[PDB]
A paper describes a structure:
The pumping of protons into the cristae lumen occurs via the Q-cycle, which involves sequential ubiquinol oxidation and ubiquinone reduction. Both reactions occur in specific quinone binding sites within the [name] (Cyt-b) subunit, called Qo (oxidation) and Qi (reduction), which are essential for catalytic activity.
We determined the structure of the T. gondii [name]–IV supercomplex in the presence of atovaquone and [name]-300 (10 µM each) at 2.8 Å resolution. The cryo-EM map shows both [name]-300 (Qi) and atovaquone (Qo) bound, allowing insight into the binding mode of the two inhibitors. In our structure, TgCyt-b displays the conserved fold including eight transmembrane helices (A–H) and conserved redox centers. The binding pocket for the hydroxynaphthoquinone group of the inhibitor is conserved between C. sabaeus and T. gondii, with our structure revealing interactions with residues F128, Y131, P265, M138 and I263, of which the latter two were previously found mutated in atovaquone-resistant T. gondii lines. Among these, Y272 (T. gondii numbering) on the EF-helix is occupied by an alanine in higher primates (A277 in humans and C. sabaeus). Our structure reveals that Y272 acts to position the chlorophenyl group of atovaquone to convey parasite-specific ligand interactions.
Numbering used by the authors:
A (entry chain L): 53 to 92
B (entry chain A): 9 to 368
C (entry chain F): 2 to 89
D (entry chain G): 118 to 194
E (entry chain c): 160 to 487
F (entry chain H): 27 to 122
G (entry chain i): -22 to 37
H (entry chain B): 156 to 398
Write the structure that this text describes.
């Protein structure tokens, strides 16, 4: 917002949301899908 | 610096209805100061050599005046550090303190990470079986990157070099703690504390007479309880197996970390992929960090009242607490299929109820 | 860390004198064992059952260490109530 | 608890609405007409970091504005 | 402050001109002064008696508002999702609210019969008040309910004792327990720097004197310190005894016969009385010389020159045999 | 902290440093008020606590029933059922 | 309260803070030692015939 | 693997909060340890200094220490020698190194007992149970030579032979000897040896906790003293109600 | 004599606050009455508007002096 | 020294401008 000094927490917000999407994608690939393809 | 003392700890004005649940910060600070005193006086007689560390700790107990007292106070006050921190965290999950105390909440998380590191480094210094094999496990856990583990160890395996640098690091970190505490309090008093009612009120009252006495009362209780447990040994907080000298080629037949590490241990028991293991810790900590800017994740204007009193729905924080306790229970037990099954149930609950805090 | 942990409301026995100075050249446990043996009869029952079934099955693998362990844990947990009355 | 005869009212009346809507209008127009770019400033001058703040010493790197004297307050300038 | 607002467009949350979460019925006045009148003409629910929870008036707004996965709280009022360029027109016939954007970017305030300057004057936010406002909104007279106890039932009145003694006795008691505990802590901490229980410094030893030769000095270990045993020559004895005539001049006068109960045997603690160094062979008086600051001792142990304040200290000793000695 | 329109003072005397926090949190007394207090040397101070004990305790315990105890009971249930499952497993897998 | 007020402890020992401190220190000093010796006696009373002093060793 | 059972709780004199150790039992336990258990175990942390005044009189302890040859040196020729033990020396040990200990005990290592009750679950109750625990094998199980069945040792098979035998030792106070009595007395002795500072610790604890509790009462009163002045305050809006 | 406060908070009457504080005194006929008459004078009075010829910052009365030098204003 | 650092927030000030 205009007239405010908080400028570094928004960046961390976007980085964190990014990182969680990342982690969940990789976890689905690692723990579920790759084994599943051995059971498919 | 006296004028600051008066501005922040004497004339500072609080809300009338701050009950005991707002006294636990002061308490963790006090356990810090106390742990520092006993630390320094333990360092004067400790030996940082793999050949003789163990007997160095035994010499304090056997042949030194009041030798036993400082070791046992230091050992027992750690448990209270962690217990007070967990109460202190849960209070602010319950109240949604992080709605406006954004940077304070971030600082809190950093302090908790510091405390975990400090405790675990301490846990290796007496140099028994549990110490050696715990260090082995946690160093293998951060293996994904080449050469980082032999470098941090100092060596191809846990060694006297490792002991020396763990001792120095355990010396240093608490004081960095203290600096971050000053930072913490800066962010806090920039805003001002919340009520249990979560309203804004003008019925304020100064600190020195009313709230200082409650701080003192709780302080008396805590000093009491620490000495009770320290002198008489009511609870088996620490497992016996650190009482055995180290053997590099034989593990102990039964394994139980310190209680404040059991939940983590439970995860490492039940998730198949080791990287999945580590990623669960990383993800949960990232989720907690994300709460600092919860006001942005939605366009409805936010309130701090969670209306958990009389509520049949309860609240996600309570489910989180019970899931965590269940994980401690399962942590403690042997590896068996049924324990693992209920482990995985509890783990899913623990992860989901943390994710869901953002969905108002 | 501690050698032991305190127990609340423990009951401390008075030393029952032996009726004959020679009476405790033989282990007092022998005088408490019968009663407890009678109290843990269900474990004896199950151990004998398993013994029979193991001897019968004929595929040549089997054992009854479980039920044996339970039997003797029962007997010991019974004996522990009175053994210290007979020791100084 | 209060007596039950003190509790005979409807708590969910919306008495703030006409004012919240006006506030939203007024604070939206300022974003539109002033906040549309990432403006550039002088760093660590005037008690403000320079990246956008307009109240002195609200951030850690601009804490402790004085070393001597009696200080002061922003509201009395 | 350090806190942003979050006015932005949103696709999960429609604007409040589209979907208000509050109950959208408001009365409107030509001038806010008129709101005075209603406060002295309406009835109020808090002026009337009820006795059971089941008699409390029922809320006007519906329970069924907010939906979605994992949403505990089902009721809200206000949101800051942003308005479009052309807002939805309020229908004043249904008593809907007209405020901010919907006054500026809408024709709502228009009336055929009236000047525009007069017409716009009725759409300030003070001219609107919800339905039920005068009947339900509380306005306390005190923080204290008449059904609870205040100081009047606890005040100590005429006839009462003085309690200053009791108060200050209470706090003095607290403090003297506190001080005892603090002193105990400091005493334990001091004691913890003291020497350990394994050391004890106890012991005694014996020495066989057959192998020694005249003019030789032997050295032995005793209670952590060195001890010299010397088989003096006749000339060493004579050197010691010649300086008995100059005892006047010495810093620590003593005669040789005391220091050598057997004249040919000299025994001392091997340590400089100045600051603890170990004297070496030689010096100006055929005795010993300390290299750390330059003290000299004679052939009997006596301090002749330098900063050391006393002679070499005699250990507690006994001759067991003609040829054996006991230390300690 | 407080909004700028609340922390605007009427006086003009310089705020002393030891009062910083006091005037950062200034708030207006809209409508004014009257208050009375008695010196604690002229009050009873342990009888007022017990005199109002039952009301306070009813309130506190009522507030916590559903949110804390009912999930607690469910969790205790789950532990008991887990124990059942384990004590049956240990015989199925290893007893003949 | 009338009894306590009659002892005039406040007038002489607690109304002036220097004397308040003197009182605190001295009462500490004496009370601590009395408490200690009393607990010593209890520890000997409960444990009679179990401690080292109560059952001398007799040489063979 | 399996969850091992939990021992029963025996009423040892010390496991109350107000009780000390029971010194006659400690003397008898020490005698048992010397005559039996010191054949294969060690207590490297114990010195005879520890027994004087706490368990035994000094004279007797010196005479005990004199029974052993203890190695010392070097001498003037740089050779080592043997001398009679003194009050300052640690307890002797039966094997020169772990390898020899394993060589004499079929591969297993007899642990050092200097902290044994603090190095096991349920401590003295476990040790008391273990010494009782030797029994014949169950149906369907057989153990290889030099291995024994015990119902309280984890996994039930243990390398230590049956430990106790009636009148294998004798007492100087006159008490009759049997395996149960020896069990009680040696467990008492080892529990003491695990931390001789126990009684000091507990007696200090009592004073500390009592005084701190009295403190707590006083501070509670002081806190309520200030609670009551604002809990009972009156605030009125508009006009004065009561006075 | 009761030790209590009675405060009327009001922010719509300008910048000035008025206060009075009281202690328990002695009767007309008490021996110490005169001493009380003297103590009242030892503490004395002050006005910022009208001051005589002695500046408050140098006055012989220490209470006036301490009040007039606070924060230099 | 014991009256150093008069403020923790804000812009400070100077004695000469009171
Ligand atoms: C095993 C599996 C699990 C793994 C773990 C997974 C964990 C996941 C969850 C993560 C949780 C959150 C982590 C932190 C996120 C921070 C995000 C952020 O930027 O927030 C912005 C936010 C403010 O943003 P804003 O509102 O937009 O305000 C705009 C302002 O302009 C902004 O200015 P301002 O003045 O208002 O703000 C203060 C300013 C300025 O602050 C200061 O000047 C304070 C300086 C204090 C120094 C004291 C010594 C500290 C030494 C490091 C200790 C690390 C301990 C780590 C714990 C584990 C130990 C093993 O600091 C910042 O802005 C933050 C800078 C980044 C902080 C990073 C902290 C973490 C890493 C630090 C260590 C890095 C590794 C190398 C060194 C390791 C040595 C052990 O700031 C905070 O909330 C920060 C709170 C304080 C916490 C950090 C305190 C330490 C500061 C260290 C600074 C770097 C130097 C390090 C030492 C190097 C030489 C040795
Ligand atoms: C102690 C400090 C030393 C003193 C000196 C100060 C040092 C700081 C210098 C670095 C800053 C250079 C960039 C200049 C930007 C100028 C923009 C402008 O016109 O200003 C207005 C503009 C704010 O006006 P506004 O747009 O009206 O405000 C609305 C909000 O910003 C909300 O806007 P929104 O929500 O619409 O989103 C806008 C957002 C949209 O974009 C995003 O949100 C993208 C998110 C994607 C995720 C990926 C992460 C993005 C962050 C990149 C970080 C990489 C840098 C580190 C590289 C390490 C290399 C070793 O825009 C950006 O993110 C663009 C700016 C990003 C730049 C951040 C990195 C700049 C550092 C470059 C030098 C790196 C060398 C460092 C060496 C190692 C030591 C640190 O300024 C900013 O946004 C500030 C950005 C820079 C961060 C603040 C600087 C830190 C100050 C605190 C010191 C903490 C030190 C802790 C250590 C303590 C030791 C003890
Ligand atoms: C190789 C093998 C392969 C095997 C494959 C097998 C695959 C099986 C998959 C099963 C999937 C089941 C779920 C189907 C969902 C269908 C959704 C749908 O059709 O949506 C249409 C439609 C979507 O439209 P919409 O616009 O979203 O409207 C819906 C609203 O948004 C809704 O919002 P609203 O406002 O209308 O409602 C209020 C709202 C808000 O309500 C609340 O907030 C109330 C909360 C009250 C909580 C009180 C708790 C107090 C007690 C605490 C006790 C302590 C516990 C903690 C401590 C314990 C110790 C650790 O309610 C909810 O949020 C309800 C949440 C229900 C969660 C159910 C979760 C089921 C999980 C099943 C397991 C899945 C796998 C797990 C992970 C595996 C590993 C990755 O939704 C509906 O019409 C509503 C349907 C709702 C259905 C819920 C009940 C489902 C029952 C499924 C039974 C499955 C049995 C499986 C047996 C398997 C045997 C092998
Ligand atoms: C400067 C370093 C000092 C270190 C202190 C250690 C000293 C030795 C051990 C204690 C000795 C006994 C105490 C001194 C005597 C009492 C002082 C005195 O004169 O009383 C003045 C006064 C006594 O007031 P009073 O009202 O009781 O009586 C005075 C009035 N007359 C004379 C009329 C009776 O004490 C106070 O008012 C102190 C206010 C605080 C009270 C509560 C304190 C409890 C602790 C709070 C938290 C502690 C954590 C913070 C510490 C940081 C480190 C962790
Ligand atoms: C040589 C014949 C021994 C004598 C005499 C005693 N012990 Fe021992 N002990 C010995 C061996 C070879 C072992 C190894 C057992 C194994 O399974 O590896 C042990 C072991 C113990 C233990 C450990 C128990 C455990 O659960 O780990 C204890 C507590 C123990 N022994 C105690 C003990 C006592 C009290 C003795 C005197 C009565 C004693 N032992 C004698 C060898 C020998
Ligand atoms: C928050 C602060 C601290 C915490 C939480 C902490 C935690 C711990 C823990 C858990 C142990 C294990 C003790 C045991 O297992 O018996 C330990 C041991 C130790 N700590 Fe720390 N510690 C802190 C501060 C310090 C400081 C400041 C120092 C020194 C300056 C220090 C020095 C030591 C030493 C020497 C040991 C070894 C104890 C032993 O060998 O018996 N500690 N610490
Ligand atoms: C060494 C560790 C810590 C110390 C010394 C500490 C200290 C304090 C103190 C003294 C307070 C004010 C009084 C009180 O609340 O008790 C406080 C408040 C607070 N702390 Fe901590 N804290 C620590 C850890 C944490 C952690 C781990 C978190 C969060 C994960 C946290 C978040 C908060 C919040 C949100 C508040 C204010 C809550 C509110 O005002 O409603 N702190 N802290
Ligand atoms: C019950 O309700 C409350 C209790 C509270 N208790 C306390 C103890 C404080 C507090 C802590 C520290 C402080 O200043 C300090 C910072 C850092 C230091 O450094 C270190 F390491 F702690 F010593 C010391 C000192 C100033 C104030 C509060 O604000 C506080 C607020 C509320 Cl609402
Ligand atoms: O197998 C383990 C094990 O898994 C851990 C674990 C417990 C959790 C610890 C931990 C996990 C996460 C964090 Cl953020 C901090 C500590 C890491 C070591 C131990 O502590 C341990 C100690 C001794 C022997 C074996 C073991
Ligand atoms: S130490 Fe010998 S002369 Fe100084």
């Amino acid at each position: 917002s205009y007239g405010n000094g908080t400028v570094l927490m928004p960046i961390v917000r976007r980085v964190f949301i990014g990182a969680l999407v990342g982690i969940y994608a990789y976890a689905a690939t690692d723990v579920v899908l790759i084994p599943g393809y051995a059971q498919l | 610096f006296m004028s600051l003392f008066r501005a922040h700890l004497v004339f500072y004005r609080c809300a009338l209805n701050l009950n005991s649940s707002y006294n636990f910060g002061f308490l963790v600070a006090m356990t810090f100061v106390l742990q520092i005193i006993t630390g320094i006086t333990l360092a004067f007689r400790y030996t940082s050599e793999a050949s003789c560390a163990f007997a160095s700790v035994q010499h304090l107990v056997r042949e030194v005046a009041a030798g036993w007292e400082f070791r046992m106070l230091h050992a027992t006050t750690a448990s209270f550090v962690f217990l007070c921190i967990l109460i202190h965290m849960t209070r602010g999950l319950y109240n949604w303190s992080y709605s406006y105390l954004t940077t304070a909440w971030m600082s809190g998380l950093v302090l908790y990470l510091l405390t975990i590191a400090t405790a675990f480094l301490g846990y290796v210094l007496p140099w028994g079986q549990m110490s050696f094999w715990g260090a082995t496990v946690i160093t293998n856990l951060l293996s994904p990157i080449p050469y980082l583990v032999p470098w941090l160890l100092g060596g191809y395996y846990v060694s006297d070099v490792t002991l020396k640098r763990f001792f120095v690091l355990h010396f240093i970190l608490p004081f960095i703690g203290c600096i971050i505490i000053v930072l913490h309090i800066f962010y806090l008093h920039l805003n001002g504390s919340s009520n249990p009612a979560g309203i804004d009120t003008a019925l304020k009252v100064a600190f020195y007479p009313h709230m200082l006495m409650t701080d003192a009362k709780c302080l008396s209780y805590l000093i009491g309880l620490i000495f009770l447990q320290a002198a008489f040994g009511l609870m088996e907080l620490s497992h016996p197996d650190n009482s055995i000298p180290v053997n590099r080629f034989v593990t102990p037949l039964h394994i139980v970390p310190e209680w404040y590490f059991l939940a983590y241990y439970a995860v490492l028991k039940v998730i198949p992929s080791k990287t999945g293991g580590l990623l669960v810790f990383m993800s949960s900590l990232i989720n907690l960090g994300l709460l600092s800017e919860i006001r942005a994740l939605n366009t409805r204007m936010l309130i701090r009242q969670q209306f958990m009193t009389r509520n049949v729905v309860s609240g996600w924080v309570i489910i989180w607490v019970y899931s965590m306790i269940f994980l401690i229970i399962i942590g403690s037990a042997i590896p068996q299929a049924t324990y693992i099954l209920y482990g995985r149930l509890a783990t899913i609950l623990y992860l989901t109820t943390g994710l869901v805090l953002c969905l108002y | 860390s501690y050698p032991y942990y305190c127990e609340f409301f423990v009951k401390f026995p008075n030393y029952i004198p032996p009726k004959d100075p020679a009476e405790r050249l033989v282990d007092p446990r022998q005088k408490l064992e019968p009663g407890c043996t009678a109290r843990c009869s269900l474990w004896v029952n199950e151990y004998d059952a398993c013994t029979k079934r193991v001897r019968a099955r004929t595929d040549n693998k089997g054992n009854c260490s479980g039920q044996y362990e339970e039997l003797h844990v029962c007997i010991d947990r019974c004996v522990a109530k009175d053994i210290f009355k007979y020791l100084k | 608890y209060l007596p039950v005869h003190e509790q005979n009212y409807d708590p969910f009346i919306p008495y703030m609405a006409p004012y919240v809507e006006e506030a939203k209008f007024q604070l939206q127009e300022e974003e539109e007409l002033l906040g549309y770019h990432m403006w550039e400033g002088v760093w660590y001058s005037g008690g403000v970091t320079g990246f956008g703040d307009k109240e002195p010493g609200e951030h850690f790197l601009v804490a402790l504005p004085n070393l001597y004297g009696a200080g002061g307050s922003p509201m009395q300038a | 402050s350090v806190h942003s607002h979050n006015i932005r467009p949103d696709k999960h949350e429609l604007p409040a001109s589209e979907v208000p979460l509050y109950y959208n019925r408001f009365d409107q006045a030509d001038h806010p002064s008129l709101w005075q009148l209603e406060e002295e003409q309406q009835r109020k629910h808090l002026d009337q008696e009820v006795t059971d929870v089941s008699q409390l008036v029922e809320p006007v707004s519906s329970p069924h508002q907010t939906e979605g996965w994992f949403k505990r709280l089902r009721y809200w009022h206000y949101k800051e999702t942003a308005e479009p360029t052309f807002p939805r027109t309020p229908d004043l016939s249904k008593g809907e609210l007209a405020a901010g954007a919907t006054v500026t970017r809408t024709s709502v305030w228009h009336d055929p019969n009236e000047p525009a300057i007069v017409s716009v004057s009725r759409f300030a936010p003070d001219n609107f008040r919800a339905v039920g406002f005068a009947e339900n909104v509380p306005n306390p007279e005190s923080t204290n309910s008449d059904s609870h106890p205040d100081f009047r039932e606890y005040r100590l009145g005429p006839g009462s004792v003085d309690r200053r003694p009791f108060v200050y006795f209470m706090s003095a008691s607290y403090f003297f327990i506190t001080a005892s505990m603090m002193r105990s802590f400091l005493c334990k901490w001091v004691h913890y720097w003291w020497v350990s229980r394994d050391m004890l410094a106890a012991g005694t030893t014996e020495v066989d004197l057959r192998p020694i030769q005249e003019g030789m000095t032997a050295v032995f270990k005793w209670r952590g310190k060195p001890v010299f045993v010397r088989h003096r020559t006749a000339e060493d004895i004579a050197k010691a005894q010649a300086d008995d005539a100059l005892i006047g001049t010495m810093k620590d006068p003593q005669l040789d016969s005391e220091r050598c109960p057997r004249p040919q045997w000299l025994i001392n603690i091997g340590v400089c009385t100045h600051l603890g160094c170990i004297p070496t062979d030689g010096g100006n008086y055929g005795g010993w010389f300390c290299p750390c600051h330059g003290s000299h001792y004679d052939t009997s142990g006596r301090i002749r020159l330098g900063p050391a304040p006393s002679n070499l200290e005699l250990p507690p000793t006994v001759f067991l045999d003609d040829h054996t000695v006991k230390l300690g | 902290g407080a909004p700028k329109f609340e922390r605007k003072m009427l006086g003009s005397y310089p705020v002393s440093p030891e009062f910083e926090m006091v005037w950062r949190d200034r708030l207006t007394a809209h409508g004014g008020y009257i208050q009375q207090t008695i010196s604690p040397y002229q009050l009873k101070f342990i009888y007022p606590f017990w005199h109002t004990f039952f009301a306070r305790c009813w309130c506190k315990c009522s507030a916590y029933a559903w949110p804390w105890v009912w999930p607690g009971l469910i969790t205790f249930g789950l532990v008991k059922k887990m124990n059942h499952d384990v004590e049956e497993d240990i015989r199925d897998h290893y007893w003949y | 309260f009338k009894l306590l007020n009659a002892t005039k402890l406040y007038e002489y020992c607690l109304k002036d803070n220097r004397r308040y401190c003197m009182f605190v220190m001295g009462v500490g000093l004496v009370s601590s030692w009395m408490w200690s010796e009393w607990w010593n006696s209890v520890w000997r009373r409960i444990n009679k015939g179990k401690l080292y002093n109560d059952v001398p060793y007799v040489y063979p | 693997e399996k969850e091992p059972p939990h021992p029963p709780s025996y009423p040892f004199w010390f496991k109350s909060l107000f009780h000390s150790h029971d010194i006659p039992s400690v003397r008898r336990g020490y005698e048992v340890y010397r005559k039996v258990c010191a054949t294969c175990h060690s207590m490297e942390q114990l010195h005879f200094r520890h027994l004087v005044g706490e368990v035994l009189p000094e004279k007797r302890v010196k005479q005990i220490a004199a029974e052993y040859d203890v190695t010392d040196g070097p001498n003037d020729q740089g050779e080592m020698y043997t001398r009679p033990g003194i009050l300052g020396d640690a307890f002797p040990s039966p094997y020169p190194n772990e390898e020899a200990a394993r060589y004499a005990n079929g591969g297993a290592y007899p642990p050092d007992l200097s902290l044994i009750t603090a190095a096991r679950h349920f401590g003295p109750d476990y040790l008391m149970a273990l010494l009782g625990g030797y029994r014949d094998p169950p149906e369907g199980v057989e153990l290889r030579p030099g291995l024994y069945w015990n119902v309280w040792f984890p996994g039930n098979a243990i390398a230590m032979p049956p430990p106790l035998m009636d009148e294998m030792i004798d007492y100087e106070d006159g008490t009759p000897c049997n395996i149960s009595q020896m069990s009680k007395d040696v467990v008492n002795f080892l529990t003491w040896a695990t931390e001789p500072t126990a009684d000091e610790r507990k007696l200090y604890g009592l004073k500390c906790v009592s005084a701190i509790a009295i403190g707590t009462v006083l501070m509670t009163l002081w806190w309520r003293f200030y609670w009551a002045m604002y809990a009972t305050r009156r605030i009125d809006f508009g006009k004065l109600k009561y006075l | 004599f009761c030790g209590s406060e009675l405060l009327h908070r009001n922010d719509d009457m300008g910048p000035t606050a008025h206060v009075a504080v009281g202690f328990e005194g002695v009767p007309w006929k008490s021996p110490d009455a005169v001493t009380f008459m003297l103590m009242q004078a030892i503490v004395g009075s002050y006005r910022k508007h009208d001051e005589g010829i002695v500046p408050g910052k140098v006055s012989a009365n220490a209470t006036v002096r301490n009040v007039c030098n606070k924060m230099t204003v």
